[PDB]
Amino acid sequence: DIVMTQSPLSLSVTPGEPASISCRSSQSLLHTNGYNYLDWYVQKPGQSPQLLIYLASNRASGVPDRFSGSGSGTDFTLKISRVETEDVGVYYCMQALQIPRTFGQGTKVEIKRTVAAPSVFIFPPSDEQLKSGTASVVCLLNNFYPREAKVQWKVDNALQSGNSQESVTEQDSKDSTYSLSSTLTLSKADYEKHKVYACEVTHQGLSSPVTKSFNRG
Amino acid sequence: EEQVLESGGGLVKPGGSLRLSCAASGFTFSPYSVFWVRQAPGKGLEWVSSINSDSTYKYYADSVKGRFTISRDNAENSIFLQMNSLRAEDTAVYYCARDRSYYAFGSLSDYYYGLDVWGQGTLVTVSSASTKGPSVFPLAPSGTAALGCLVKDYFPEPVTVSWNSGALTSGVHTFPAVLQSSGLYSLSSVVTVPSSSLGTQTYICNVNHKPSNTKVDKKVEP
Incomplete structure (x- = not known):
């Protein structure tokens, strides 16, 4: 299967400052069609999990423009350009190249x-x-x-x-x-x-x- | 497409069975593959099962293979997960999620969007322990006063706590339940209020424990 690993597992960020989360896969997520099959999700306290980024670098509709994603192959990054207080939650990457679908461990974001x-x-x-x-x-x-x-x-x-x-x-x-x-x-x-x-x-x-x-x- | 709701979760003994349902609201499930994803106690997300639009491709995580069966019904606009031979480690919150991609006739879409609508989740508890409703005790106020309710000795999760029928929300903290040595859960819910209000305002905590059909209100007074 494909194993996903995130780093760091916890972040503490001052509002207004940027935050970055890395995701690594155990094999390449680049398909022959040219796209990287990596999503980012956020789970906030008592809410439905939310799609943030799909195909590595595309922001899903409804997602604030402070969120962006990048990377290719086995190395990916979610960036929040300017953190807001409501950004507290746990962020997961997920590969969508193969079954089983697999998720990273989750990275907890704390507001400093x-x-x-x-x-x-x-x-x-x-x-x-x-x-x-x-x-x-x-x-x-x-x-x-x-x-x-x-x-x-x-x-x-x-x-x-x-x-x-x-x-x-x-x-x-x-x-x-x-x-x-x-x-x-x-x-x-x-x-x-x-x-x-x-x-x-x-x-x-x-x-x-x-x-x-x-x-x- | 705006929401889904999972139901059917509850307490079952190991070896038992449960059927979960996922119902769509504001859109039709029919064009889409649907995924089940679970989250075990204080842990991360793990994929469980998926079914494509016409039910020809059903996939399962190795951990549930041969025990779980996924299905769907257009007339009900719903997806189902039949769980047999349940194991202790199947205990988790179960989420249903719509994948908005087009899958051709199986695991990889050339027209990918992703899991854009998830539900709030339904808790499945697999245990030999018996259902038990909570006892509710007041935490009486001794400027600003703190008061609360101790919700003690219940199984399984969850309970819901509100204050004054939901009229009081500001200053409310309902703590995560903690498993005691006895194997029963306990939590407190607290709120801060004006000391000057104590003589003229009533404070009642409303506790609901669906698994045991218990509903308790408790007056908290000085």
Whole structure:
């Protein structure tokens, strides 16, 4: 079959700056009719995948003119001349020379913006949840950049390990920020034994870590 | 030609069967080859199957050969993918896509355009685990206040969360579901609102889990 490889696998670009993604095939995509059978697609958070470029260098109708493609044989490039905030997504090349159709790994495009510290909130478990026998404590980091953050849980000043999970949103298409949840899970029995619950957040945008805390349990 | 919609996806046990459908809106499928492409959990795109305009050329990825069968019906303006002997690793979002090219009478077009109309996708989950509807808990607000709903212990994906019947969208973040140790999913949906509104505005999260036919509303109050 034909194997497709993209480089890089991740890009971070300031709005207004150009971005380039390379695609390499394991054999030539140049057909004897003179055309190169390489497409580019984009998949954005919660949307139908979109055709950007076909036959290596042709922009599909409806696609902004900031997009162009080039290359021949086994080496191809998608270029975005001036990135916009809505360009966040994953970009794939696909060869259309042979069956099976094959895709590159995907290249994630992130929009670079100025550093933004998270707003932090902590939520004790509801009285309602405690009836289930489990207690979830939720720490929310809202609207921050960059994505990297450390969240540390302490229970009566004892550091927690192995009992929390994180989830992060896709980058916002307008403000280029992320939000993150950290959820600490313990038995109602263990929750009710301790008094102070705290999440400490460490982030590029915070000169010193921020702690949010509550008393109960 | 403007849209397609995939349906038929859901939870099935390994060894089981499902039939997916892809229906065209705003154009007719008849002139075109149609492709199925899937995306396994947090991974990239992989081609599954294709069928040409008159059904003489049906192609399948090696991984599904002999297990999947593609077909089409003009009267219904639809393409179908019958999936038999399902495997755990068939778990994926399945997309249908119209190729606008002319294919002569098979894999290579001299009049190529490409896959220009794709659907939103339908999730197929292949697992021995049982369906379970979520429990929904409020995240009560303690300037700007944050509040939310914890949507806990459900299977399979997906759930949908809205706020105030869709009236509240600004400031909403619904987190990607995370698989817990138990093999059940959990997520939170949060929104920020004015602290001064808490006494006079109602906040209700609307949670829908189609796979278990559960629909829950939860009032979030201080």
